[PDB]
Design a protein around this ligand. Structure first.
Ligand SMILES: Oc1nc(O)nc(O)n1
Ligand SMILES: Oc1nc(O)nc(O)n1
Ligand SMILES: Oc1nc(O)nc(O)n1
Ligand SMILES: Oc1nc(O)nc(O)n1
Ligand SMILES: [Mg+2]
Ligand SMILES: [Mg+2]
Ligand SMILES: [Mg+2]
Ligand SMILES: [Mg+2]
Lengths: 364, 364, 364, 364
């Protein structure tokens, strides 16, 4: 488990745009076989009927398939594609590409460095979404993802991304015909449950939350249960969970590091600023050391932000997750200097209620 | 209980437009003291953050207040204002004004005629919405509304309109602080529960559903439980239920009648045409005999309409109730020849699943 | 120019779903090399940021590419993909696949039969959209599409579909930097101009409108100028026009025919019913003779439908084209019995103002 | 012209909520006769079909009418109500109430203090919106508003709020029937033209732009023409312009001051922090000295923010002004510590292209 990790933030002109990826390959800066994960932001609505996520995944897989002479569906088992829809406000569509190579024969740098590991769960039944099966399978996958990363302990774990399913009317009907009530019948709300259960799965595996408290009924209810590392993103494009564990390792030789923090609420730019500082980034022009930022945002479920009412949860035209991404994307852009950052919405059991975990990847 | 009922469909140029009502008053066609109910369609979104409903109610109440030298809030206890938001597609904003006078004699026509009665429940606690208290109180109010109407039996009952509350984040928090979980935490979904429990209240009172089956857990679950007379409309503008029972009575001398039916699904224009025909209306210009049509529409919860998939429940930009109103408004407009008709969306336990009750008011 | 045309309506479970097409190929009912056009309805929003159109095109092209051992981009020059986004209300996502084979060595049936021809224009400059260049190039393409179809005269022409571009901020900036003002700076509105100019291109080529009247300034202004055959659909997925001319020919041996009509407004189900009748389709159960219906819908630009105000053009949450498709999709579904029909919105210079052309393809 | 100005930021629970205003009156902190202006933020969509603006105005006017024993419509001639819809992200609905009393002496502080003056133009014809008449009339009103304020010169002018009309389909048709093309036929876009022409009116009156350049064709075209003081807000609720000039005067004895700046773009929190610092406010709890912040936000019309593409102008679900408000509301909230601030969207000829003027009112 001794790798070298490269990370590349590449712009997208549209969800299907693979041209930035083709550039890296054709300029020799990354080898197709080494790519193990892509975390993207696509300009669909980030909710149920957002197919930019699947479209982006399909084009990326096709692009890599050509080079590796593989069928796209094979590439999707080889590579963890995690596409988060919704690029509201200043959020600029893009992919973060993660490549993994066997460690440059160390000659080991003086500290721990960026490592990454991936894992998948089985497909879930509709009636399992938001519930115990999803929690337990996710926990399992988080641990396998850690092992794959060569992450010695929780202390060295800085970010757990999970892609998870959602419910459609067909899946709901399919569950019903087996005499099983799905966790909800509202497709929008199903995303929260899927994200929530998955996040609790991470909290389970990281021992941030004791197993005893993780009953189905605690999901979306018990705000106190949370992982300060979990980033969950739901999608119509898959029936299983995809897990990416990102952390630091003695065995990694990457010229990159990662640190994590928590935003106390959607506008907590200070915490981001602080975590960035903890990686020795001073001026505005030292920001070019940051490869990307990854953050969770949500509408504060009490209906208030710093004592003032918000309308993000009462807005029947624009779902709360869209407002949340717009808000947090702006707060972060004001710090790093632009909106080409990964901000994912709906942060149930991820960081504090109304806030969310984030991580930063930077040059060593 | 011997009334004469007048019914006036009046156009609106905007939610606050009272100019059509001021016209009827100033042309002597209706007396302000006789107005007992207004059922409106306002051009807000018909969901949670739709304040066109409250705005329309406030201006109508102010208009009537001037003429009756009353405070608006007094008028709202005197008159049942039921404002249904959402006028999508060809739906044309308007009010239906119901006026009630002691029976005109003069002459009393042969056979039963249009009568109307109103009732109110108490304010509900947030945690009571969608649950037993709401069911039980509504049933009670339906009976009082029937008495007030002079409706001898269920057979003579043709339409029960109910206006009901919904949940906001504050109400949810209020409930939580009393250690009571609200029926849902999603404000959009709360409308369905409120409409559903209220509709089951109507079914209880009309003996369409036996009391034994009406447990909290059946609400939104058991599609088989329904009233073929119930029209439920949720709103942020009130904390209680408002009930309008419309039917036929020997004691009424109205030059108007009412018939009812069920649409099997959102495009079941045939059933509407059939019910219209059961009132002897057979050619396009004979449609002028119809004062208004009142109908419930919903997205079929199985995700299919006549075997083909629909996207109304997977659309995170446009809520299902908006699609449903647009669809059913069109289907009805194609029959009567325009969209100035009352179509309300979200028809849980109202008519068949995917369909909804409707009624027609016509010249005798 | 002696072909046999097959037409297949196939369901889609999602924009990228090619499984119905793979079924036809693997059951031998269509040969990949014979497919000359696909007209689709995808469940994106049908406006600017709708990538379901491009996603569907990309998967279809990939699917056909495998079979023909071609690159997808080659297939897109071989086959006219026209994807219309927006499946609101009961509209059910699907593709209509058109295949063309050399005429079964006639043995010529007794009448004219369904023929189809395709053509493309060059890419347009941003500043050319909605303007004269787009008009004139389209006209040219319509004629080449007619010739390719073997359509002897206008009388035998029943449907001209055109796919056209739209403006984005980048295209607008690119135009500006050349010192050329684009026809509009609003991306939504640019779709209307693109559809409009393209429709006038069809009217030019069909001699429905004399060339003298087709100045730039008449586009979107002069409601009297229109083609009763034009169906225009704008999209972000292309910079040129794609044209499909569908009609009747002596040389075609297709077991299919086509007839066309005009809806006078969005709810004019009667005209559809009538045109269907003109193809000897009687009962509800003879509807299975209809392969598909293709129709244009729009929000009446005077703000009124049959004398009553509509809100489709004042709604800042839901664009008019979405309302229009929902409305007309319902009106047609009430006739044919389901919503799996092609309804495209925004019908500027297509049929009457507030109405739109439609066509019907049926078994001979 | 010797006034004392009080300014009160008051929370709203809903658009019609007057309970905070009734509190100030009943606690003696403001006298109804002294109130000269209310600038509000209401939780409608801030675009065409937003009636929260008119609803809020109607309830405020009714509330004041009771106390002053006046009809609401009289109050609206006495008081400048400027309601800006759209409270996306962390934006918290509220009113800023401005009260004006004859100068309190007592004591008159050293140096210039907050003064305020109001003015109205005539109603515009539909065809005048976005054009020369609107520009010229606005300029006139700005000067009268300055006089009314006792603002000696441009140097002492810090904020010009203008409320302006927009186009509906009826107004468009009305214009058409007079043979006059309206500036646009798209209701959404009409807001930009109205805001733009009005803003150029302010620039004319303040001599920021020479009269020679202000031809109709420059409106929305020439990005170089702008006022660094103009804040324009369009609305369906009025046919004229309402102008509020806010500035500093020796004659004023207010315990309040005002400073202004420009955001270079939507995330330019630095400029806001800088302007706040120019009023000696340097730590987070010193923010309590700020009464409110007032700011213009817009989607950068080149489609980029700090070199990265944004999707705010390509998003057909959510209009650019909604994104813009969400973004700038967040950026400002991250500075002052909450979202109860006045942020209005669509900043054409207001500040730099992609940016907007703002002002700050603070305790002296
Ligand atoms: O697709 C997506 N994006 C985000 O930010 N969150 C979820 O749940 N899904
Ligand atoms: O305001 C309103 N309209 C409709 O159609 N349905 C509900 O639940 N509320
Ligand atoms: O993508 C699309 N669909 C429709 O119906 N109309 C347009 O212009 N574009
Ligand atoms: O109501 C309103 N709000 C805003 O922010 N901008 C306009 O033009 N109108
Ligand atoms: Mg959280
Ligand atoms: Mg029903
Ligand atoms: Mg037309
Ligand atoms: Mg500007």
């Amino acid at each position: 488990h001794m790798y070298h990790i490269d990370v590349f933030r590449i712009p997208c002109h549209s969800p299907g745009d693979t041209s930035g990826l083709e550039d890296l390959i054709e300029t020799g800066r990354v080898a197709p076989a080494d790519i193990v994960a892509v975390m993207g932001k696509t300009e669909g609505n980030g909710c149920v009927n957002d197919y930019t996520r699947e479209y982006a995944t399909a084009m990326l897989a096709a692009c890599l398939g050509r080079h590796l002479q593989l069928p796209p569906h094979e590439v999707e088992k080889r590579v963890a594609f995690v596409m988060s829809g919704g690029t509201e406000g200043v959020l600029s569509p893009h992919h973060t590409v993660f490549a993994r190579r066997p460690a440059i024969d160390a000659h080991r740098p003086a500290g721990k460095r960026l490592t990454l590991g991936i894992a998948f769960t089985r497909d879930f039944l509709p009636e399992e979404i938001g519930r115990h099966a999803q929690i337990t399978e996710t926990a399992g996958a988080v641990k396998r993802a850690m092992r794959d990363a060569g992450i010695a302990s929780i202390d060295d774990l800085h970010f757990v991304q999970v892609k998870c399913p959602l419910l459609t009317p067909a899946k709901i009907a399919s569950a019903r015909s087996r005499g099983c009530a799905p966790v909800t019948t509202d497709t929008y709300e199903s995303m929260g449950y899927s994200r929530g259960a998955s996040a609790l799965g991470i909290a389970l595996a990281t021992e941030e939350v004791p197993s005893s408290m993780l009953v189905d009924e605690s999901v979306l209810n018990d705000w106190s249960l949370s992982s300060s590392l979990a980033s969950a993103s739901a999608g119509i494009e898959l029936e299983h969970n995809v897990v990416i564990a990102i952390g630091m390792s003695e065995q990694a030789t990457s010229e990159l590091v990662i640190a994590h923090g928590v935003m106390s609420d959607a506008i907590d730019a200070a915490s981001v600023r602080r975590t960035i500082e903890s990686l020795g980034i001073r001026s505005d022009d030292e920001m070019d050391r940051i490869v990307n930022v990854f953050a969770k945002a949500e509408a504060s479920p009490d209906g208030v932000v710093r004592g003032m009412r918000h309308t993000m949860l009462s807005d029947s035209d624009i779902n709360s997750t869209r407002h949340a991404r717009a808000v947090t994307g702006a707060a972060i852009a004001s710090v790093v200097g632009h909106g080409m950052v990964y901000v994912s919405g709906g942060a149930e059991h991820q960081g504090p209620a109304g806030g969310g975990p984030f991580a930063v990847i930077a040059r060593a």
